[PDB]
Amino acid sequence: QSAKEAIEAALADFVKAYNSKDAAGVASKYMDDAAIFPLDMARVDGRQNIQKLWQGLMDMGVSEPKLTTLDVQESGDFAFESGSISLKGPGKDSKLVDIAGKYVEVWRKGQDGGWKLYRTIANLDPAEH
């Protein structure tokens, strides 16, 4: 019932879609005009480009995403969330290592009543060029 519990549930489906290598399913968790802002990197705009991003990560051999949601605050048709992510991905030596990052993001109640991602700002913890 809680917005926090609703988002954590949505992120649970997010992880399942990714581990099934279903980039379209992953992208369906986003608003059509959603945007991702990786810090010191190019922003990714629109559902299809976001699908391309997650598909690209799958192709790289990125796997086992683990999401840790901190607090979630509701404001009108928006929900504000902060959290952290850990996953397995290739280093500059092509070897698979544990990679971590932090994020804040804004969800929006779509046409349905369900929560969909709208804005995400994220960074990879220092540790590929």
Ligand X SMILES: C=C1CC[C@H](O)C/C1=C/C=C1\CCC[C@]2(C)[C@@H]([C@H](C)CCCC(C)(C)O)CC[C@@H]12
Residues lying near ligand X in the complex (CB under 6 A) are found at 14, 36, 38, 57, 62, 67, 85, 87, 89-90, 99, 101, 103, 105, 117, 120, 122, 124, 128
| Cβ(65)–Cβ(89) below 8 Å | no
The residue (of 43 and 77) whose beta carbon lies closer to ligand X is 43
Cβ contacts of 8-12, under 8 Å, gap ≥ 24: 8/69, 10/107, 10/114, 10/115, 10/116, 11/67, 11/69
The residue (of 72 and 99) whose beta carbon lies closer to ligand X is 99
Closest separation between CB of residue 46 and ligand X, Å?
Answer: 14
Closest separation between CB of residue 38 and ligand X, Å?
Answer: 4
Closest separation between CB of residue 39 and ligand X, Å?
Answer: 9
- Both structure tokens of 9: 């549930």
